[PDB]
Amino acid sequence: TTSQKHRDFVAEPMGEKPVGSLAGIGEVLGKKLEERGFDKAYVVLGQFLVLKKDEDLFREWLKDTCGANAKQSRDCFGCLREWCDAFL
DNA sequence: TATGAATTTCGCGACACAAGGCCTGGATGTATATATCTGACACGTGCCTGGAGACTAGGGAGTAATCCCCTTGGCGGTTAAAACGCGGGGGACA
């Protein structure tokens, strides 16, 4: 259902977690995202909120911004959406 | 395109690490022991007045006869008090 990384990210507010803290976002993808400018997880979330929490927008943008497959982009969107439901 | 490859991300074991629960001992105040002195504790003496002994009085006190009386003892009934059940709501309790 959910990755343990996803559950850990969901359980608490993100605060200042790096983009690598996102579920399905490891060293390589998180590093690529930081190179693209979204150096922080909350920057990526602001992008996600600007996309009006859209799954397709966020996942396709993530895929074209770091190279994540459907799995990693889907996990990242799910993590962001569930965190938004929990705290936002 | 179906297959492999790549890639990656989540799940897994060894390692070292630190924090908490008994074991132990020593510093800690308390009870034990002991030398010093000093005026009270006790001892002992002279005495005289209270204690001890004899004689008397008589009135207090023990004891028997009597009354009555009142205190013990029993019955009926009529209760009004006492006994028992209940609901509570307010007081004692934490």
Curated annotation (Swiss-Prot):
Instruction: Give the result of residue 31 to E, as annotated.
Output: No effect on histone H1/H3 binding
Q: Any idea which GO molecular function terms this record carries? A: DNA binding; double-stranded DNA binding; identical protein binding; protein homodimerization activity
Q: Name one GO biological process term.
A: response to virus
Q: Which SUPFAM superfamilies match?
A: Barrier-to-autointegration factor, BAF
Q: Which residues form the HhH domain?
A: 19-34
- So what does mutating residue 8 to A actually do? Reduces binding to dsDNA, LEMD3/MAN1 and histone H1/H3. Reduced interaction with PARP1
Q: What is the effect of changing residue 57 to R?
A: Abolishes interaction with LEM domain-containing proteins without affecting homodimerization and DNA-binding. Does not affect its involvement in nuclear membrane reformation at the end of mitosis
Consequence when changing residue 53 to A: Reduces LEMD3/MAN1 binding. No effect on histone H1/H3 binding
Effect caused by changing residue 11 to T: In NGPS; shows a dramatic reduction in BANF1 protein levels indicating that the mutation impairs protein stability
Mutation: residue 53 to E; reported impact is: Reduces binding to dsDNA
Pfam families (alphabetical): SAM_BAF
Q: Which residues form a coiled coil?
A: none
Task: Answer whether the UniProt record assigns the keyword NADP to this protein.
Answer: no
Q: What is known of its domains?
A: Has a helix-hairpin-helix (HhH) structural motif conserved among proteins that bind non-specifically to DNA. LEM domain proteins bind centrally on the BAF dimer.
What disorder does this protein's entry note? Nestor-Guillermo progeria syndrome: An atypical progeroid syndrome characterized by normal development in the first years of life, later followed by the emergence of generalized lipoatrophy, severe osteoporosis, and marked osteolysis. The atrophic facial subcutaneous fat pad and the marked osteolysis of the maxilla and mandible result in a typical pseudosenile facial appearance with micrognathia, prominent subcutaneous venous patterning, a convex nasal ridge, and proptosis. Cognitive development is completely normal.
Specify the protein name.
Barrier-to-autointegration factor
Name the source organism.
Homo sapiens (Human)
What would be the name of the gene that encodes this protein?
BANF1
